[PDB]
């Protein structure tokens, strides 16, 4: 069929926890790939997210 159809919508946002590893003294982001994971500690971090 193609008389029927569903729009494969653009997906969105996903919060995570595991990437926030420890820096042996404090937080340590660990991004697998291209995941600009918005992160916001007490001060504004890169809420745009980082692959770094």
């Amino acid at each position: 069929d193609q008389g029927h159809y569903v729009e494969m919508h653009q997906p969105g946002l996903v919060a995570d926890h595991s990437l926030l590893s420890i820096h042996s003294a404090k937080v340590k982001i660990t991004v697998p790939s291209g995941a600009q994971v918005k992160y916001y500690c007490k001060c504004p971090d890169v809420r745009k997210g980082i692959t770094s």
Binding site: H23, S24, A25, K26
Partner: protein, 107 residues
């Protein structure tokens, strides 16, 4: 903590924009390490010339100015003069321990 194996000096003869690079062996000598691009003499300007190796802190004449230019937290020896001559060790006071930069002696 993040052992800051500082690059030894900021090379300058004429007054010019040098960078007192202060490497960290473990990581980048950074704000988390709080390298702070310090241009610490014994008594004089023995403070964070940088501000967490990002901006010119207390002991800078814009010569220990905060700058992590690499894993080396360059105490940015911008217009380094004879008075700018100081052991601009981006002295890391990291979150776990100091692990400060040995020396990046501007001159």
């Amino acid at each position: 903590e993040i052992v800051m194996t500082q690059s030894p000096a900021t090379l300058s003869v004429s007054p010019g924009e040098r960078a007192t690079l202060s490497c960290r062996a473990s990581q980048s000598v950074a704000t988390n390490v709080a390298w702070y691009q310090q241009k610490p003499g014994q008594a004089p300007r023995l403070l964070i010339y940088g501000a967490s190796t990002r901006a010119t802190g207390i002991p800078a004449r814009f010569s220990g100015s905060g700058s992590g230019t690499e894993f080396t937290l360059t105490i940015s020896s911008l217009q380094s003069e004879d008075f700018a001559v100081y052991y601009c060790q981006q002295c890391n006071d990291w979150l776990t321990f100091g692990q400060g930069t040995k020396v990046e002696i501007k001159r």
